[PDB]
């Protein structure tokens, strides 16, 4: 698609009889805009992007009351889950959840998501149809029958097709100078000598948004994944991203090799080289 | 905006 909105839940039990922790983060594409952490005296939902700040105290109470309720329910769920897998209170366990809507190349809903994991592995996921579930084992099937009796799938469909989409469009407009303004990467190639296998070429891409980018080294023959070190995309902190790919080995020369940058912020994919 | 969990929404 073109744009997405996602909520990430992390429910974690505490070592013994301790009260579990509930965390929620909300994203629109790669921009985080809200947070909740149950581990505070009086936990409140907080803004994390400058465009969600215009929202009234009714918006913030709705959020806070949903996450304060999730805190109590995810606690019951963590206990239900350790029962399924016959685990003691001794250990700490994690329920993770990802839900959200993808707007279309137009801006209508492409598809909806609702995936859960237990201790970092898939447990239950809402199918593309937003009507059925994919359970991983017999324990996730206990959750499926609970969620079928509670009409969870139908209530996700209503949310994802409506509420989720309306608010994403709302945020997209309110933050259109950030969320709808693609930042092209600040690109340069650096030279890092060694005499023996000869020097190293580092192709940088800096201060770009969204996170989706592609860096390849073409000595002509094509993209050559084997001799390239492609470091994964990292955030700079200013809501922008960084990435580099390097090659070693002229086996030829540093000027034979050219870097290729693919990003939305570019009118056409770049052809970058090292300039001595 | 997040979705509210209705009653009996537990794992």
């Amino acid at each position, epitope marked *: 698609g073109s744009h997405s909105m996602r909520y990430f839940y992390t429910a974690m039990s505490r070592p013994g009889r301790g009260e579990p922790r509930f965390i929620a983060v909300g994203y629109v594409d790669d921009t985080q805009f809200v947070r909740f952490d149950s581990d505070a005296a009086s936990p409140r939902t907080e803004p994390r992007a400058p465009w969600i700040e215009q929202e009234g105290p009714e918006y913030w109470d709705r959020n806070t009351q949903i996450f304060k309720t999730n805190t109590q329910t995810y606690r*019951e769920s963590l206990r239900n889950l350790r029962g399924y897998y016959n685990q003691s209170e001794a250990g700490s366990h994690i329920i993770q959840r990802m839900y959200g809507c993808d707007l279309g190349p137009d801006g209508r809903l492409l598809r909806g998501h609702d995936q859960s994991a237990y201790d970092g592995k898939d447990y239950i996921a809402l199918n593309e149809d937003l009507s059925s579930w994919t359970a991983a084992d017999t324990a996730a099937q206990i959750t499926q029958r609970k969620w079928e009796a509670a009409r969870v799938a139908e209530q996700r469909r209503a949310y994802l097709e409506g509420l989720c989409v309306e608010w994403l469009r709302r945020y997209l407009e309110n933050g259109k100078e950030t969320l709808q303004r693609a930042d092209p990467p600040k690109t340069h190639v650096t030279h890092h000598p060694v005499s023996d296998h000869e020097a190293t070429l580092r192709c940088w891409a800096l201060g770009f948004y969204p996170a989706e980018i592609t860096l390849t080294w073409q000595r002509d023959g094509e993209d050559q994944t084997q001799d390239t070190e492609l470091v994964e995309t990292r955030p700079a902190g200013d809501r922008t991203f960084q990435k580099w790919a390097a090659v070693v080995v002229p086996s030829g020369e540093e000027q034979r090799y050219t870097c290729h940058v693919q990003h939305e912020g570019l009118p056409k994919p770049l052809t970058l080289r090292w300039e001595p | 905006h997040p979705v509210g969990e209705a009653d009996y929404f537990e794992y």
Partner: T-cell receptor
Amino acid sequence: EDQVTQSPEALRLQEGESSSLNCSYTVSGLRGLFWYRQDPGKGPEFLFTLYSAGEEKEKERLKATLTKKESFLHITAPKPEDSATYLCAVQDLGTSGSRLTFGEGTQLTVNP
Amino acid sequence: SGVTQTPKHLITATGQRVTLRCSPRSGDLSVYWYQQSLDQGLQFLIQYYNGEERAKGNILERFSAQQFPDLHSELNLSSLELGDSALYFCASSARSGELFFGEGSRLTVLE
């Protein structure tokens, strides 16, 4: 922000005279709209639930329909036994739990 | 319905305290308290799920309720005023989301 407006508050029909009861609603996200029937002295009685615009539920002389803004409870050829208060309620997606926000109702009296 | 409310009727004086009992439907784990003031609609007071308080409406500080481990609820109304005269309904929610109401409790408060 959760408002349920029912019209008319009072309805005075002649036996056999069909009428439509309006229920206007504002919600963050619709979880479901409910129609209850309430007799004087007793508690609201569950009739049916509509989740999506175009969904229709029918129990005898009562038919309910849903739009993105309102719900209609159509009463066909009413009888004196249909005289009661008809309550409209809504469940919100943007709030927790299954709580209902009630409308003030449509007090119906069917003249026999 | 399946929900049971006691007492169905209560006549007390101003400044007194009353306790309203509610048993949800067999199988239902939640309790919802509603107030229906004379010639006025149902107003959400408080909700309990499995002995634990969840959602809170416009229940007064003077009012308190709780859900017991056997799932039954008690709504206590203290420092009673004439205006506290209403119909008090409790509802239990189905697993599929519909609420089911009791007969109610009609409280009349007199000077």
